[PDB]
Symmetry: D4
Subunit: 222 residues, 8 copies
């Protein structure tokens, strides 16, 4: 049959389904249940959503932070950990890439207004299915295998990765230097973290679809 | 380690299953052919409420008073119901769910309350979703009888009803207007309970309602 | 010190009682068993408007045209009137309140205007809530007649009506369609006036309406 | 008979009091002269959240950052706390409540977050009301300490804060912010606890939060 | 010093009168007693659309399908037509207005289109309010005939209708369902025209409709 | 180069034409007299959905259950089909469009589903617009049959129907309730296909639907 | 009979007049040339609140913080005030009104509260519009001081203020802001009181506010 | 027959063209390669208001304050103007339309009013859109001068402005702001008038604004 992909909590399930995987949605559950959750799947897909609980990366909530739901963050961190434990592949999107970062000691900017240098627009008003800002890609990256340098991708976020967690490296950044893609460095599992929303572009962007195909393939290798 | 309950594509359903000790997994709508793999991933299947069932599935054209439906969901769930019965794994169906099971195995539905021959009671309650609104007579011999006493008060959020009951099923509860509110199997390859109301919206307040979900999970553990 | 008037839980009701010299407190819905204590706190009781009365309370299942209802409120207000009657304290009921007193003592009601045998007039007026809309005939020998003249224009914001009158009560007012607009007591331990309209919305501009609250306070003044 | 708790004028509040064995009644807004009668009806007093407190009451005109406010309410609650203090009955103030008591006794407020000298933390959380959002430091010796451990996460739905603490009170909790989150009385004629957060929205899911209301009721039946 | 037209109550009405050369004034709702003082300020009266007429004014309790109504408004408008009549000043009634005049002189109305014994045509058009929706047959010998040809398309935005026509009036136009669309006067102390439709919404793109307002003004500076 | 398709007026219709190889241009509503100039620059005419056709066009006054209509569009489109017929250019009509053609040539319509003598199936589907809802029987010898199999499920977003079919046309599709879903011409100077449903909302996910627009473009190409 | 008070338009103002004995008349917007005929129909003129005055009328272009304005209303009301002064008829202006009068005679305004050099107080209250929010200081020898005590609480509903007072006028009231809340005529051909607030929303609950309309009526019959 | 005016995309522009004697047709967004066929169908081109032009087209990345943009529309309209010029067909551009032709030929834009050196006047008026709001200074020798008098009140519904003017153009109108409100061509192959305001919303109640449309169809004739 098909490799099972656990999607954390529609365009995400269409993406997996189009690429040959069998998607199941993991509801928010208690952290201790993460191990059972990950045993059910071959790969993990972290979805977009709301800002991450600030206490999780040792910060109290700033006036500019949006809504956040602690139970979700706790559960996903446990999923990330259990997934790394089993060496299963991980594809993270938007907040998802920021969650993996918080999970292993990193930090975030709570709001775009807190970046020292003037940032570009990362909350595009342009149709979400289209790219708004240009990214530079590390040539030797996994990203590099699927997207050409200077590709335009969408953006729907007001938070950014501040301190990058140890054991990762930045593979994509916009012209304002903000981190748009992260990959693993000596990690037990294959990992691609993207700041944009490829599940909104794939229906009209072959290259975006390939990121999902990549996850399913890696899940097949297991 | 908790038994896996597949929840058909909402939150109050995962809460109920977690409260009772099961590990819920939400099954997205997928191609009917993936139903076997889906069921292979779980020990029990919980069918949730939702839109009216595609009438063509019970060989009827859409009447003017039918609501919205989505063929892809119906197709997939019918497939799930079947892969489940084949596996002998337990099934719990709620509202639309009880109606889908009935359609999956050859029964029919009343497309709207105005089509019942008799003027039925209100089944789309305006009362708080968590509170019961209409009393049900229950067959003392049934599985339901083990969890709810006769004349139990349950909620109601629907405008369609089971018309012709599919073979190998017994009606287990009706409201004063004689409308089918609960259905159990008869000689079926797997344990089954279908209620027309929404226990997932009452279990936080009604321990008896919780027993229904607890029953599903206990049966599911049997594998 | 002023008499304490317990208002059943709406700002216009507290305005009316304050303007007439009483000290109002709002009683939240609570368990029936606290009704005794609640009443001990007041000198008079005021039943306000709100949702329809749960049908099972007068032995009927919910019909299709019944609006929303909330069992704990009716259950509590029923316990309240019984504790008020038992203590001989005055009771002034408005709209939903008059209907609740009727059901509390064994009465019945029409679940919707559509269900009345003869075609009724408008009772859910569209005219500004403060203005009277339908004319009522008043019984000359009643409590109502002391403050309201026959053929008085009264407002209306309801869709249910009193069906069968409870024992120990007499109908004091009706609209041209024969529908009950006012109910008074007969051989009961308390001073009772139940009006089907909303005087709290008219008093700030209809001195006659204000007198209905003045009555409740004075009657309560008997302590 | 249960102790009667007068709740100043929502459902969550009555839910909390009932869950703790008290018999609540809501005291609608009335003329200040009736506060005495009002309090003569209860054994305990519970002040609830709501609109900003009228600025003039703490000798200030309205800054263009202030929200709505209804003077008639402030007056009534003021008299209400006075009659409660004089009657020696226990008081529990929530959000707006804690600020009114402060004002009723000479204290002052910040008309808005933007007006605090140093950037404050978020106090009008976007996290659902039932959950705690910011961490608070609690005085180990405080009454609050008896029911809440230090560093407890607490919710926040406010844009004003106490500025100058009315005398005869002591702050018992603050956020990393320095902002005042809890106030207890210093040798007052009655038991008192004012919290800046919303425990009525937390008790259904936070056992410790239920205890604050339990305290009021236990303290209410103590007197009487 | 153009004709002063009093407009009861409406911006399109003021636009209609202003384009026709009159000086419009808006008469607020006042006590019926002030009606004479009101009409003295004007040379012409224009009754506009609005809510349904209070049912008791024509001896009827409110029907289940009757819409909203405002007694004060009806009371004042009736005293307004009587005063306008005494002074022999011209009156132009629109929609609700034509119906009020009727009720003012002892006529009745259907409380709702569903009450008509024969199935009526649509009179509450979903068509652009500026365009005509139903065709009307006009009395070739009527005032209306001098300004509108027969079978012209006119708009419609009403749910009530004239039932029994008050004496001293005549029907000047009807739709194919027999409903009354225009009322003229017989031996009335003043010029009168009441249409059931909304010409103030059509005159901007319908010359014929502008003519009716022109008639009211011509008739007003024909009494000054 | 590409065949030009004049689209009467949304986006999905232009998407359909563009996907199929035609160059679409939207023809705004204009004066009937400009109809021949309009058809002169296009190779094919696509009539889109929209409001009900003004009843006056088929000799009926508006029923209470008729919806909104806009005379100028109907007149212009009428002028368009006539000019298109005179040029022998292909015409594809959708929903309202098929009903406008019927009226233009002398047919009639039921103003509302409630007026059909026999209970009709649902034609204003609640299922999302993109999916079929009712099954249609197709005339095996029809043009439609070259693209759709019998019993094909098609969508429905209408409350009006063809009553009396204009002469020189034949019905080629109906739903189990007998209502007309597709009309074709015979001996007409132009290729013509009229469907009651909305193929533009299904073509993105229903190849057969796309064929309908393909046929229009293929045919408009044969005339060059 | 009863004094005919002309009320300028785009209901509480009507209520105020009627209760005080005047007979209100609504003056729709018309051409400036008709102001003479309009005033000739009344004994008193009441200028009501509304939109900001078009900036050009006081020789300024629209700034980004200015709200909506409708030139026809303004032009007509300016002609209205001129015809009133000519006929010596009394004038009572409210909110926008007091501002129009000041513009019609050469004065200027602050296009927005943000453009004031001194941080002003709140003049667009969130409080029940029927209640007063900010305390005003009243001039002892004021026509206003004859109806309102000093330090009275009054309401607000504006974001624009009078900048430069116009000739023949004296500032009668001010909030601790310094902002002007009332202006009176000085050597003017007619009685004039202009209040920045909305007494028409308080009069039903503040007897003193009722006096202001009483003054206009009395002064009008004379 | 009448001169055909292709309208890019809006009912008021159609009304404008019809009121003035032209036969309008709406050109929906299509692929750039189809622009030449589009212009071959028309006698004149009318560029309409709409969303901000995408940043990259004038070699810039999106600032936090740009509004929404739709690359396909910009791509097609640019191909459209290029085709119109090759054919020498007249062009009348309105609002974003003026900015699109500017970027089309090398120009630049201010992504938002807050990015201008000085505090600009209000250019997103709250006044009824049919009325003028800010007075513009017009060049006495302007083609624009032939229809509008200097110090003319004109409407405004935009938050972006022309920054660097493209070559072969000249500014013909400015608000007391210094902000460019009208542009005309300098030795361009076709007749051209670019306006920052929305005359199609004023012509109903402003004879001069109608003249701008009449001027387009007369050139297209
Ligand atoms: Mn981004
Ligand atoms: Mn039911
Ligand atoms: Mn009634
Ligand atoms: Mn806080
Ligand atoms: Mn009509
Ligand atoms: Mn159909
Ligand atoms: Mn002010
Ligand atoms: Mn501008």
């Amino acid at each position: 049959l098909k490799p099972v992909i656990g999607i954390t909590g529609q365009r995400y399930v269409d993406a997996i389904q189009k690429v040959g995987g069998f998607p199941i949605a993991l509801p928010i559950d208690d952290p201790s249940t993460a191990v059972q959750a990950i045993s059910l799947v071959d790969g993990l897909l972290l979805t977009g959503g709301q800002d991450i609980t600030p206490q999780l990366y040792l910060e109290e909530p700033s006036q500019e932070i949006g809504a956040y739901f602690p139970p979700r963050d706790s559960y996903e961190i446990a999923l990330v950990r259990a997934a790394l434990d089993a060496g299963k592949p991980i594809f993270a999107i938007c907040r998802g890439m920021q969650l993996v970062n918080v999970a292993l000691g990193g930090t975030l900017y709570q709001d775009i207004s807190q970046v020292e240098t003037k940032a570009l627009q990362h909350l595009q008003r342009v149709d979400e299915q289209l790219g708004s800002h240009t990214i530079d890609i590390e040539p030797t990256s996994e990203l590099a295998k699927h997207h050409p340098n200077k590709k335009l991708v969408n953006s729907l976020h007001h938070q950014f990765i501040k301190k990058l967690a140890p054991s990762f490296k930045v593979t994509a950044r916009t012209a304002d230097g903000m981190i748009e893609a992260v990959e693993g460095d000596n990690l037990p599992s294959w990992y691609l973290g993207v700041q944009w929303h490829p599940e909104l572009m794939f229906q009209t962007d072959p290259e975006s679809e390939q990121l999902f195909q990549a996850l399913v393939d890696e899940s097949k290798k297991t």
